[PDB]
Symmetry: C3
Subunit: 273 residues, 3 copies
């Protein structure tokens, strides 16, 4: 990927204001800010500046300052050290689609970096301590991966080809990057196997501490080690219609009107069933 979660915000919300850095500036912050005018935060004002808190640590201090009461969550301030943070619009994590009001931890950001993710839906909650890791080669005399560094150009060839041919897909090789649907909840200390999973269905619930080794159907609940299907969120009737209506792609338009539907499943289907 190429661009910063902050810069996507600044490109959309800065609106000719100065960036006000609230916190100790880092190397890659200073770079992400070089297209803009910035200075260390002193006295701030939503009319004059965009406050950028470097770390979540720095954000708590700003919010606890009386000057923060006029700044709206994303239109006026942001936390630099939070590439998995949620936004009110569709965004990129490296080059990975992430829908509105979707969030994930650094473990998922790295999976976005390693090309493990094809896409992440809308209104999806992935806890920070979740993880997405692929497998190493299991059909070889060795299991290590950093022995590669000792390989020369010749040995590298014969090694990379067997990885491409392996149908178990070590390092998610020769497969499709996995997809995460919308309205998905993922517990903590969880594991989705990038070497065997290609699709988390929309609405799929992944319990805490669950290790998910196969694709999860939409609106399924999975817990345990390994993950088993404990229940389904909704009767199948809802499931087919929910795939049809796709509430998660509604604009803020249809969300506030149909709040009574989105809140009572019973009310949702008496109108859309």
């Amino acid at each position: 990927g190429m661009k910063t979660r902050l810069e996507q915000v600044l490109e959309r919300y800065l609106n000719g204001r100065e960036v006000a850095v609230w916190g100790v500036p880092t190397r890659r912050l200073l770079r992400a800010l070089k297209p803009f005018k910035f200075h260390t935060a002193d006295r701030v004002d939503p009319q004059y500046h965009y406050v950028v808190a470097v770390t979540d640590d720095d954000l708590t201090d700003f919010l606890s300052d009386e000057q923060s009461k006029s700044f709206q969550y994303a239109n006026d301030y942001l936390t630099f050290d939070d590439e998995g943070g949620e936004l009110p619009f569709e965004r990129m994590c490296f080059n990975v689609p992430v829908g509105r009001q979707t969030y994930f931890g650094d473990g998922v950001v790295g999976a976005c970096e390693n090309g493990y993710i094809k896409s992440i839906g809308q209104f999806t909650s992935i806890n920070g301590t979740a993880e997405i890791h692929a497998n190493a080669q299991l059909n070889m005399t060795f299991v290590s991966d950093d022995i590669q560094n000792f390989f020369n150009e010749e040995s590298m060839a014969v090694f990379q080809e067997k990885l491409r041919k392996d149908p178990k897909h070590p390092y998610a090789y020769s497969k499709e990057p996995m997809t995460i649907g919308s309205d998905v909840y993922i517990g903590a200390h969880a594991f989705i196997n990038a070497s065997t999973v290609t699709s988390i269905g929309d609405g799929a619930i992944i319990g805490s501490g669950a290790v998910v080794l196969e694709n999860v159907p939409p609106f399924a609940v999975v817990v345990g080690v390994p993950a088993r299907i404990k229940r389904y969120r909704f009767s199948k009737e809802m499931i087919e219609t929910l795939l049809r209506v796709k509430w998660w792609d509604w604009s803020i338009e249809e969300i506030n009107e149909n709040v009574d539907a989105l809140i009572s499943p019973e009310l949702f289907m008496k109108k859309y069933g």
Copy 2:
């Protein structure tokens, strides 16, 4: 909550010395220190200064410096970036009671912030990678929580009321904040469900990687996914008397005298049974 773990220490142990910052100062450190006199650490002396190490990283460097051999653990130095660290006196984590020589990771500090915790006992060890998270709404068409941000004032009402009425207590709503007793041990990669747990009994042991979904009785051992009662630490005789004596509330007074009792359970009951 309102106040800093460091400031509670400085209010009690500074004793008219200067704070000596050992490390790169952060935004919220600089604020926590504005009631006091401070300067970047150069040459230090327990008579002259209170050394404040910013991060646990910065603490290791100070202890490894020859100037640190005269500073006692809490009376003379402290690590700013350790709100879950243990103290020799009863303290607050935000507005949460935390007894003496009790510690926990940032996951528990956030639960203290989210109001999930009512209290934490004395001499309780909670590993850093432990976690306390509540559940989202399960009786709604959606499971997401940050869709809220898209709600207006009108849709917000009808949404918040159903949360208050939900007996499953999403986000620990309309329940009592959970309590953690004294002499409690909690393994790592563990989970206590703030949406269904209200009391960890005194002495309760929570094995590593265990997901705890219901209240744990005092002095019970729980492991597995989900957590089951593997054994009890003590015969019930000890349990009733341990609730009566409550050694964990002894001053340092009765601790050093009754060390032979506190060390041999057999000796503990021949004196208190």
Copy 3:
């Protein structure tokens, strides 16, 4: 332990160049660099400088800079905040042997600090969120460990002796520090019990989220809570010969030649069986 992963590299690869710090300097970096000449990175050149990125965050920014394309992974740059990072040569983590192209997270670095580790083999991959923790005392009225701080010199004696006598080895007391063989893979959110484990066999695979309570035989696969032996990587024939040949101690010499053997187990034994 005594010395820095960076300093072991600088002592071997600096070769009369200047250290160029890429990132905000920390207290313990500034100390690790005091034997050398250094300055904040401006324009860099592998001939003139050794680039030191402070944090993994700072490393990503350097690699993404056009000046980084001439710097080789370890000979020319390094990440200070990565004591578990892999190296092309045998190294120390505190005073713990760590072989070539071996890596582990901070959880394992702390175990190296707590003296829990005797050694770590070659070409071994331990994920960052892995952990190695010992147990507290289970034969005492209390389970807490920081009550110790309240003990005086007298009560300390009678407490420390019972720890030394405990055959369950709380805090890995009176046992041998555990050993991790070569070609070992360890999943994330995993647990090796320093209070009951003394040897992870060479080639042993530890699945994600697995809690390992007993020694693991060489080339065994363990998953589940608690860990059970799911399968063996190789037929026993390979296992005995793999212990004999010990490919992991080959120089880069025998690695690139025998790549066809190291890649096809079938080819490995037709030559070494």
